[PDB]
Nucleic acid binder design. Structure first.
Lengths: 154, 164, 171, 96
RNA sequence: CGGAGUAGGGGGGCGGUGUAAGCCGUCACCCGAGAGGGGAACAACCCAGACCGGGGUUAAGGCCCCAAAGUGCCGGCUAAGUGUUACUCCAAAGGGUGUCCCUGGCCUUAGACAGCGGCCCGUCGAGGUCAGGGGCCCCGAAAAUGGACGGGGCUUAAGCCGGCCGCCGAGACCCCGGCGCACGGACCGAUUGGUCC
RNA sequence: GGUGCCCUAAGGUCGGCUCAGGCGGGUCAGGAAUCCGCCGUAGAGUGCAAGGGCAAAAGCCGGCCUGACUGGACCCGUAACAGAGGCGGGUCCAGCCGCGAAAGCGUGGCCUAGCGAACCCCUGUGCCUCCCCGGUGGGGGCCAGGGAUGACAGAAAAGCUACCCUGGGGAUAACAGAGUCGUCUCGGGCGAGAGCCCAUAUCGACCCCGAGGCUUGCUACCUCGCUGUCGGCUCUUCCCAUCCUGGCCCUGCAGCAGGGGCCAAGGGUGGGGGUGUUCACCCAUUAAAGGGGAACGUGAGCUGGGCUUAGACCGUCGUGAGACAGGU
RNA sequence: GGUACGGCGGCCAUAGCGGCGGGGCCACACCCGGUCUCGUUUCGACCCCGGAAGUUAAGCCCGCCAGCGUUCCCGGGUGUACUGCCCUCCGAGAGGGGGCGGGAAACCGGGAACGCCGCCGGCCA
């Protein structure tokens, strides 16, 4: 399973441990998204940065929209079905299906940038940055509901 | 054994069979050991090598193996053990005495002398050996007049012929 | 003497060891058990602390005297086994400053003693039979008055189970 | 009052034993052997006063680099410096 | 290999001491050496780290007027202008048939007051009476130029509790265009380099 | 809480042995100690503090000895990480030795305290050297050990200034202000009791909870030429925790007067003696002759009695020069 | 392939302490006596030396007992006490609360546990 992580809070007034962990996760700025695998070594880091990010399990339709809209190559170039059909024998939908069901890695697409840069959510965050999603806020683990947010921020 | 602060000694020390300080001093050397124990009626000896799972014995000898507990029997025990060791492929050793005190002129050192004469290199200084008139039997014979040396020398020649 | 709001709280380390404290004082309290001691009463009325607290031996002795005089005038020595459960082990100190040197070398000399109590801890107990619960509650009230913080009383049976509501309803 | 560091400063617990040890250790420790490059834990035995390193390094893990006499040469990395000790095998324990 | 500056630190959290304020240490987030958006104004509380010109969406917080955006929705509480205060920068022990709730016992079709009549009945003849606990408010509650919820003012609120729906709002985030810097490269100079990618 | 030592053994090694206390027997004023047996994980002892270590022992009893030695390497700590002269310590190589049957141990004290640069001098030991050369006496050099600096990484070392000067400091006092409220002023809760009986007319112990910022302290944020002053006279204003004047309540209120409490700050609250005084004390009147704040209101408004320069006297202290939150 | 036998060890109380019943070809012990080696600041009491009249009562060996003590398992106590990170959460303050992660100790009940392993011998047929 692939997890999506979005950064929500700034690193000012935060510990160097957290800052460095976020740098290692490549989450340098706010409203930036990264996709990783649900391994224990990643879950530990997510638990360490639990209070500055949201995360959850992502869906293939959402990933396809994400690649079609906010995906970039070296040079900040858009991704196109031309390029995908050339470098691989697939379309974006099939690539996403695979990626989320194993059998394929995003970096298998040559010159793919590993960070997605989103605008802030339409209608706004409907919960405080100072609290967690469970108790009515915004931070921490959602489930499939990370896709609603990715849609609002796409 | 009277509570959580009671240290229970090693098993061999509870039994009364091993001195671990002297065991340590003897193991500090990598040469093998010549063990000699003595009972009310017999002697036993052997040659031992160290292993951390348990000591391994290579040779042994008993006064039963002889007559098949005194200074002549001990000297003949030393004869046997020294003649047996030189076969197995070991020419070096150091003595071990256990809880037996060292007294000038005892059958333990008689065994040491027997093995030396048999030709096993054992470092020692000839001041504790018993007198040869004690190794002989003159002691017991001259006690008997208030295992004659004959049969002593008989057994001697027997053993030396066997292990020439 | 000095007000009790200085010693009320428990934010300082424990200071209860006399082989190292120089010039520590003796206690002004010697009696902790009063009344009948071998009489196997029914009801046990016990005080309980509402938050962590530090009680002076002066307050303890005043409580003792008042409550015992009340129970004697009303119940009778033949009844009412009365016990104080806590002993003063803490040592209180005051800085000898008030010519003076102010806050130079401030480490207090010992002045008095106090008992430390944690939340929901028993302080004292009255063992009594049914016909004197009124006076046991009166004693609870009188003791409650003479304490730095607030406290609540409960009742217990043989086997030590709570029967407080049932006994309070039916008087 | 500033107090300099010495060999046995703040060692009340670090150099004590559970009352159920209370004596000489089993002899397989005195007679240990290690090879150059082996990783060793530094675990001081408080009943042997010979060949004992500064208790400040109790609980660390070093590597063996050689031998001198009956003592082994152990190297540790304190911050960015290498430090060398000559330690008796009774104060050492192998890693795995 | 060479050139320095630094040897008075402070806010915030933790520890020892002290009536306390403060004193001494500790962590290494901030101020010092840090613009902008908020807290009425606030060195260090919240959002957030800044080349230039523009276009959009959000954050902290807010939406009766001052003042951009709701005289917004549902259920309940308060009658004291209590309150309208995240912190910086807000008075207690003890009490209250003041009101709104929860629980557990005891009497009831003749009970719990008063009353015709000395534990009794004919009548007022329908529910009542004791214990605990919770929410909001009240008493306890006195200071000096004239005056402070930021002000006006506000009572099924413009206050409080439990929840909800829309909108406004940064130099943060997205986008278009311009300047420079670092690294690498190609070509080219009569000296410390230049044109372009 | 301790050290600025001590020890020819309390140092090395070998062998043998096991302690405190209690109980049961026998002496006996407790028996301080000697005799007997049993239990007894150390409840003892260790050369000396504290902590740690230690039982066929590192403790006790004995024997033999001087490794408390010479020539030399490497490493750790004082001083983490991250620099050091001197000082401690650890692992070893050779030499000559001790104990021990042997293996083995031994470079002082079971571990952590008991100590000190450069220059100069003293002693030991074997060698190099002193101006053209060689001799003699005497000098200089290399290595080792001793002689001291406790302000202990090491000057050779007594005071007054009120005749005082220079440079600075709000990094640091007196001084008003800010903070705090232990203390101070003003209160409250509960109820032992006193009050002929009757807690509550009045008083109210012990113990608990507070307000004010008008007393003094604590701190050292502000000012080191801002003004550095106390008291008095003069002039204005505010607070109430009310002394009188207005109106009420309870009383152990007959009346006259008294106690205690509530609402009310509109008006009033004065004159004199001694003392620099504020305050306190006294006198005669009076309805009563309240208490606080405003940079301890008010010196570009006055005064200058006190206090805090330079002159002088007394007492006391000091060898003296001198000094006194002592007096004049 | 046997024996109710022995020497040297390793793990060092799951092995200890205490108790109960059984055994003696060889063996281990108790035991007799001290001239001789060795020795008793008195005592062949303990160590050393010569044996075996004698005994299985002690030690040793076989097996059993959960009585004291130690160690481990399951269940409760209990996700209780404590705790790392964030919070324009509460509360006059003291101090507490929520979310994500960790997690005891006493005490109680029921179980295992009265040692495991390696080397070398002697007697025996």
């Amino acid at each position: 399973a692939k997890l999506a992580l979005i950064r929500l809070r700034s690193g000012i007034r935060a510990r160097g441990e957290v800052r460095d962990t976020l740098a290692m996760l490549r989450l340098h700025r706010i409203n930036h998204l990264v996709i990783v695998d649900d391994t224990p070594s990643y879950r530990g880091m997510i638990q360490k940065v639990k209070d500055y990010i949201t995360w959850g399990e992502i869906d293939k339709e959402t990933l396809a929209k994400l690649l079609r809209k906010r995906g970039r190559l070296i040079g900040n170039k858009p991704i196109t079905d031309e390029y995908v059909k050339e470098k691989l024998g697939m379309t974006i939908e099939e690539f996403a299906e695979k990626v989320v069901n194993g059998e394929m890695k995003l970096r298998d697409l040559p010159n793919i940038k590993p960070v997605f840069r989103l605008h802030p959510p339409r209608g706004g965050l409907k919960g405080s940055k100072k609290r967690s999603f469970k108790e009515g806020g915004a931070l921490g683990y959602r489930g499939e509901k990370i896709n609603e947010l990715i849609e609002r921020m796409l | 054994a009277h509570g959580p602060r009671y240290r229970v000694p090693f098993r061999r020390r509870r039994e009364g069979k091993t001195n671990y300080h002297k065991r340590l001093k003897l193991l500090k050397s990598k040469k093998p050991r010549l063990v000699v124990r003595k009972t009310l009626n017999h002697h036993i000896a052997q040659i031992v090598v160290y292993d951390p799972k348990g000591d391994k014995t290579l040779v042994s000898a008993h006064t039963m193996e002889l007559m098949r507990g005194n200074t002549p029997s001990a000297y003949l025990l030393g004869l046997l053990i020294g003649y047996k060791a030189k076969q197995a492929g070991i020419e070096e050793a150091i003595l071990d005495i256990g809880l037996h005190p060292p007294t000038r002129g005892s059958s333990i050192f008689a065994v040491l002398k027997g093995a030396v004469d048999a030709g096993l290199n054992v470092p020692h200084s000839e001041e504790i050996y018993p007198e040869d008139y004690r190794i002989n039997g003159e002691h017991i014979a001259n006690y008997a007049k208030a295992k004659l040396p004959e049969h002593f020398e008989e057994v001697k020649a027997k053993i030396i012929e066997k292990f020439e | 003497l000095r007000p009790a709001k200085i010693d009320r709280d428990v934010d300082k380390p424990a200071y209860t060891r006399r082989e190292y404290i120089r010039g520590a004082p003796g206690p002004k309290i010697t009696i902790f058990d009063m009344g009948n001691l071998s009489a196997e009463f029914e009801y046990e009325v016990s005080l309980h602390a509402e938050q962590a607290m530090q009680i002076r031996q002066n307050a303890l002795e005043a409580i003792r005297i008042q409550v015992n005089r009340y129970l004697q005038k009303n119940v009778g020595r033949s009844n009412y086994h009365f016990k104080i459960r806590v002993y003063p082990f803490q040592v209180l100190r005051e800085n000898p400053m008030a010519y003076g040197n102010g806050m130079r070398r401030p480490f207090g000399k010992p002045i008095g003693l106090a008992a430390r109590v944690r939340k929901d801890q028993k302080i004292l107990t009255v063992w009594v039979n049914g016909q004197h619960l009124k006076f046991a509650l009166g004693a609870m009230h009188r003791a409650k008055m003479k304490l730095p913080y607030s406290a609540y009383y409960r009742i217990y049976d043989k086997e030590g189970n709570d029967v407080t509501t049932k006994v309070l309803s039916t008087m | 009052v500033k107090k300099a560091h010495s060999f046995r400063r703040k060692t009340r617990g670090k150099l004590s034993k559970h009352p159920r040890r209370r004596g000489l250790p089993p002899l397989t420790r005195f007679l240990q052997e290690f090879e150059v490059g082996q990783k060793v834990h530094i675990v001081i035995e408080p009943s042997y006063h010979k060949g004992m390193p500064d208790p400040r390094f109790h609980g660390r893990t070093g590597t063996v680099v050689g031998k001198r006499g009956d003592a082994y040469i152990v190297q540790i990395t304190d911050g960015g410096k290498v430090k060398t000790f000559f330690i008796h095998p009774v104060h050492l324990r192998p890693q795995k």
